[PDB]
Amino acid sequence: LTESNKKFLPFQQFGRDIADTTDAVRDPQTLEILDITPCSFGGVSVITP
Amino acid sequence: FNFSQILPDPSKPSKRSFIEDLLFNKVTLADAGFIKQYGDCLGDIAARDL
Ligand SMILES: *[C@@H]1O[C@H](CO)[C@@H](O[C@@H]2O[C@H](CO)[C@@H](O[C@@H]3O[C@H](CO[C@H]4O[C@H](CO)[C@@H](O)[C@H](O)[C@@H]4O)[C@@H](O)[C@H](O[C@H]4O[C@H](CO)[C@@H](O)[C@H](O)[C@@H]4O)[C@@H]3O)[C@H](O)[C@H]2NC(C)=O)[C@H](O)[C@H]1NC(C)=O
Numbered sequence: 620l621t622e623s624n625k626k627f628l629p630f631q632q633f634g635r636d637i638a639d640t641t642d643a644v645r646d647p648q649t650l651e652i653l654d655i656t657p658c659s660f661g662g663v664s665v666i667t668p
Numbered sequence: 669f670n671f672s673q674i675l676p677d678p679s680k681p682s683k684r685s686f687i688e689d690l691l692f693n694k695v696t697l698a699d700a701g702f703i704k705q706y707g708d709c710l711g712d713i714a715a716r717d718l
């Protein structure tokens with residue numbers, strides 16, 4: 620969760636992506652907008668003789 | 669015969685000819701992510717990228 624520059628409208632709670640996954644949320648207690656990024660991942664290759 | 673337009677130009681850092689430079693400029697090849705290995709793709713920067 621990071622700080623985001625998105626300007627949410629007051630009737631909006633969640634922000635969606637192109638794949639209809641939640642990308643930006645609004646915290647209920649404090650009204651800052653949070654941006655959600657999936658954790659670091661990638662492929663692994665093994666080079667062996 | 670003049671081959672200065674298809675022989676490689678040593679002034680270019682990529683060592684490509686003039687016509688090869690035009691052929692590479694005409695095709696708008698995407699970075700495709702092997703160039704974009706940087707971790708600021710994870711952070712929210714610029715606009716939404718495909
Ligand atoms: C085989 O063919 C090549 C290509 O035609 C000949 O080589 C010379 O190539 C240049 C362009 O590559 C011809 O044009 C001259 O370019 C000079 C350099 O400026 C250009 O190049 C730089 C990069 O080097 C660019 O960054 C820049 O933006 C320019 O695009 C210019 O200074 C020249 O201008 C002079 O001549 C014109 C003629 O109209 C005058 O009006 C100007 O006032 C100025 O005096 C020129 O434009 C150049 O003509 C080619 N040379 C010849 C003799 O034709 C080879 O010579 C050729 N070889 C054989 C054996 O045929």
Ligand SMILES: *[C@@H]1O[C@H](CO)[C@@H](O[C@@H]2O[C@H](CO)[C@@H](O)[C@H](O)[C@H]2NC(C)=O)[C@H](O)[C@H]1NC(C)=O
Pocket residue numbers: 706707708
């Ligand atoms: C990927 O790794 C390279 C190499 O460590 C990083 O390049 C360095 O970046 C910092 C800050 O941007 C510079 O102060 C260094 O001088 C750079 N080092 C070299 C050798 O160029 C690069 O920043 C990393 N990518 C990300 C997104 O952090």
Ligand SMILES: *[C@@H]1O[C@H](CO)[C@@H](O)[C@H](O)[C@H]1NC(C)=O
Pocket residue numbers: 647648649
């Ligand atoms: C409950 O949250 C609100 C913000 O929506 C805050 O102003 C209030 O102080 C909180 N209640 C307590 C008891 O801290």
